[PDB]
Design a protein around this ligand. Structure first.
Ligand SMILES: CC(C)(COP(=O)(O)OP(=O)(O)OC[C@H]1O[C@@H](n2cnc3c(N)ncnc32)[C@H](O)[C@@H]1OP(=O)(O)O)[C@@H](O)C(=O)NCCC(=O)NCCSC(=O)c1ccccc1
Ligand SMILES: CC(C)(COP(=O)(O)OP(=O)(O)OC[C@H]1O[C@@H](n2cnc3c(N)ncnc32)[C@H](O)[C@@H]1OP(=O)(O)O)[C@@H](O)C(=O)NCCC(=O)NCCSC(=O)c1ccccc1
Lengths: 304, 248, 248, 304
């Protein structure tokens, strides 16, 4: 027999009344949200680095202004998520240290280097595109503060995703060298973006409880499939290709069938051994350590 | 028209180059709130750069903000030496920001009374942002100056290290004077009372000392820069230099 | 011919990019004797870059060392990830130098037995210089490692921080293997015994620890670089990009 | 009456027997050479910075290799001069600290920024050219160790001066933009190079004793005049101009007559208030402070 607390919780979840910070919740539910919301917030912060890498080199003042606005928004999104996470009883400073220590994760996608300006428009298009599919699907996540953060974030982010696509379209309609730059960025970012949705439904330890507790409303594979169905037409509009020999339309099912993800690479990456993992964490650790005197100054001044 | 073009370009260049510096801070700040703040300021300044530069291109009858930003070399750039200074530590960035914001506030306040309507309108937008910047930079001046011993010492060193470049803020040349006599430009010499009233008070409230070294460095407005500008432009312009004449 | 071209270019790029890094040290060293030493090494490496790159251009039937150095982007550059690492503190520079010198000694020793005569001759010149470099870098490894506590700690951190990039030193691809099977190139996998015998002993004598992290980073040879390379090329290539096709 | 020591010294100077480290010398003679040789050595070190500024940006591998060799030689020349200076009883470390502290000078010319690649060839041509005229004129300076250092240095340096000129000739024979770059560098470096010879004969506090003691063999103005006579034909070979409206040939005297130097600027510069003074000293001070742990490691290791 479930306790009455446990039973009432299940009933609330079933009737889709949002869970709020003062409501009882299973401890494993509290903890998985601290894990998920915290690492969602971590991703915003680390995610400023690949795009930030091109702020000083962006080819036009317009594209530079757009990128600056986008990175500013990501910082803002981090802040929203940390506040949401804190309603669960965690401390932003604690989970942030856990990120720096490698004890909490951030999105796999931010371990990939920006090797060209095309990469920036491709991140705005494919990477924010993948994030948005996942985030819109979390607008009815069962925990109220998380659901409302998703709404606020998606309202802001879809704008930047559109700007990313338009930067890609400039390249697609530009010189041969620009087109080649775009294709190469797509070749390097396509599969990493697909990985943002998470492991397969067969290899997803958190899915069982998350789906039961209506934290996750669609399976990793369901969201990834929708992203592919939605995104392939956009690749076509750019006159570009997807680096996937197995990608094809299946009229029988009405979906794009696509090739197998490299799960060995995926596992390497989320475990700290991808292309930029060390550099991303080194950069955030450096920011933290070298900023210490500033934070201590602020604290010391506030008390006076 | 050439004088007005050069004057307008100077203002744009100040904002372009300072914006570039702020951009380098992205993701590297002591706090997420500071990352946000610096990106915000950098974005405001780039906005102003785009406005001034666009007007300069219109005045010259050719080019645009991108031909101006990406196809001039360091001998044509006309920014203040102050804005090309390296970011250094957070106090260095705050000192540079505070000196410039105090100046922008004093300048744009007066420049919105320009007899040139486009200059007036640009300044009218810019002043609202500069006021925000000054609250931030002065706020941090006080926090660091009157924080810990360590932060106090870094804020003083930062102030001392940039001081020599403050002379250019009140430097007038024949372009400044001729346009100022037509009621178009602000004669920078007449900005000193306002800037000093702001900056001396801020430094004092921060519990710091006004440097006694007489400021002596100018040349930026004439395209005679420190050795910092060339490597900034190399980075800023690479892609345009490699793939010129394209749309992005 | 394409494989030989790519192989030769890889060797040139390693030397070009490392030489660039060393150049940044000019005037900034802890001692005048070290400034001299680093400029010397940078000059040797640039020499080797010019040789390898010139041969690559001859093999390709077009271009020269300058078209190769200044008109390729970071996706075409084929240097080891190790050589594009920032200079960091003096231990970082010494760690990077020692790892590369140990490798160059092991490589050029074998590459002077190449069935390609030009590759053999280039290697024969290069090995004499690499031997000098290794004496310097190993000498400094021991001095820092077995100096003070502070210098000991910095030398260990420097070693740890670069370790992951050592995997690329023994990475073989189809270009390596095909050419090695023709007795033209050295299969990098067969360099590990020699490199490890050198480097493990040096680290040990330096009173330091071989990192236990299994090295895992490659990609440089395929034009898949860290984020350090793009800004290096922006700086290195600016003038050629601005004023292409000229004589200097 | 001079003492017998003093009298014997004057007689040695008159007969041009070189003074050597073990010989008696007036204390004011010892000190002015420590001053002059020390600041000559300081100049080599600081002088690596303006040229060094372009090592990573040089337009061809050939010009880059040449510049690297040149800067390496300057370091070597510094070392020669410090050894020479030390034969007089000073310590390299002490006079080096005095340089860092602003208590000793280095050549005015190194306070000017390198704003273009043309500046590098112009430094090799005009700046090394000026140094060489001065240094060849010091090959019969009365103090043996100094005289022999000048010989060694001039043998190496004239080669690099020629390479500087050839880099300038590439520009002079190149595109319109290259030519304009060269002219601009000349416009900015011409007068500073003239200042390398020192103040006028009327305003030169050290000249009286230096000339008497055969430390200086030609007056500042004599050397400057020879440089101008030698260099003007070289400007002409490049098809370039000198930024001097008063420059003209005077058939009556067989010299180029040239305009007045800006002595107000000269005084500003040698007193720490030129264009790059602060930056040059900051760079050397930073090198010294940040290199401290390295030097202490070397010392600690040597003792073990
Ligand atoms: C769908 C996931 C990602 C994973 O499903 P779950 O049921 O939670 O887990 P599973 O059991 O399926 O997986 C097993 C383990 O692998 C972890 N893992 C899996 N995939 C990844 C991955 N791709 N990267 C890293 N780790 C991954 C997973 O956490 C678990 O390990 P832990 O037990 O935690 O140690 C879910 O956490 C989610 O929706 N999060 C919120 C969305 C979010 O964070 N979005 C990023 C914001 S985009 C943005 O900020 C931005 C965009 C553009 C510009 C700037 C900024
Ligand atoms: C001709 C001078 C320069 C001056 O005559 P003196 O009789 O000694 O003095 P005076 O009484 O005429 O002057 C009054 C005061 O002003 C000082 N001053 C004057 N001019 C300058 C100046 N231009 N810069 C700075 N200071 C100057 C003078 O020292 C004195 O002050 P102190 O009493 O010391 O506080 C003489 O010292 C000499 O031949 N030195 C050796 C040559 C040497 O150092 N060459 C540089 C190497 S080039 C190189 O290394 C390189 C080249 C290319 C690439 C890389 C590296």
């Amino acid at each position: 027999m479930r306790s009455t607390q446990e039973e009432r919780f299940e009933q609330r979840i079933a009737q889709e009344t949002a869970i709020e910070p003062q409501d009882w919740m299973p401890d494993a539910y509290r903890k998985t949200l601290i894990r998920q919301i915290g690492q969602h917030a971590h991703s915003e912060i680390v995610g400023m680095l690949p795009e930030g890498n091109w702020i000083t080199r962006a080819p036009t003042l317009r594209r530079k202004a757009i990128l600056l606005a986008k990175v500013q928004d990501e910082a803002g999104h981090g802040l929203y998520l940390y506040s949401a996470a804190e309603t669960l009883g965690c401390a932003r400073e604690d989970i942030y240290q856990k990120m720096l220590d490698g004890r909490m994760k951030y999105s796999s996608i931010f371990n990939y280097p920006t090797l060209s300006w095309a990469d920036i428009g491709v991140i705005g298009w494919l990477v924010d595109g993948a994030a948005i599919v996942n985030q819109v699907a979390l607008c009815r996540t069962s925990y109220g503060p998380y659901a409302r953060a998703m709404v606020k974030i998606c309202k802001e982010e879809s704008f930047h995703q559109r700007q990313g696509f338009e930067a890609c379209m400039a390249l697609a309609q530009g010189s041969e060298a620009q087109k080649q730059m775009l294709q190469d960025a797509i070749n390097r970012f396509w599969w990493p973006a697909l990985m943002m949705f998470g492991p397969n439904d067969d290899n997803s330890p958190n899915s069982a409880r998350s789906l039961t507790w209506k934290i996750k409303r669609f399976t990793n594979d369901e969201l990834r499939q929708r992203f592919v169905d939605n995104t392939v037409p956009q690749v076509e509009m750019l006159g570009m290709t997807v680096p996937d020999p197995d990608l094809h339309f299946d009229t029988e099912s009405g979906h794009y069938r696509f090739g197998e993800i490299d799960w060995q690479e995926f596992n390497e990456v989320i475990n700290g051994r991808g292309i930029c993992n060390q550099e991303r964490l080194d950069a955030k650790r450096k920011a933290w350590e070298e900023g210490t005197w500033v934070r201590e100054a602020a604290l010391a001044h506030a008390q006076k | 028209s050439n004088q007005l073009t050069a004057y307008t370009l100077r203002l744009g260049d100040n904002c372009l180059v300072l914006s570039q510096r702020l951009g380098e801070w992205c993701g590297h700040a002591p706090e997420l709130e500071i990352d946000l703040a610096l990106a915000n300021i950098g974005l405001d300044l780039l906005g102003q750069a785009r406005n001034f530069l666009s007007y300069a291109a219109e005045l010259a009858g050719e080019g645009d903000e991108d031909t101006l930003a990406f196809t001039r070399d360091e001998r044509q750039f006309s920014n203040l030496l102050l804005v090309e200074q390296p970011n250094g530590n957070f106090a260095d960035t705050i000192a540079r920001q505070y000196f410039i914001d105090a100046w922008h506030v004093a300048l744009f306040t007066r420049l919105m009374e320009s007899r040139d309507p486009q200059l007036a309108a640009i300044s009218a937008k810019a002043i609202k942002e500069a006021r925000y910047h000054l609250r931030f930079s002065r706020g941090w001046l006080e926090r660091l100056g009157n924080g810990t011993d360590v932060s106090g010492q870094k804020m003083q060193q930062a102030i001392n290290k940039l001081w020599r470049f403050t002379a250019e803020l009140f430097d007038a040349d024949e372009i400044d004077i001729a346009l100022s006599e037509e009621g178009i430009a602000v004669d920078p010499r007449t900005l000193r009372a306002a800037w000093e009233a702001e900056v001396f008070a801020g430094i004092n409230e921060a519990t710091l000392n006004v440097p006694q070294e007489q400021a002596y460095r100018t040349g930026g407005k004439k395209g005679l820069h420190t050795e910092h500008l060339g490597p900034m432009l190399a980075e800023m312009q690479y892609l345009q230099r490699v793939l010129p004449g394209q749309q992005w």
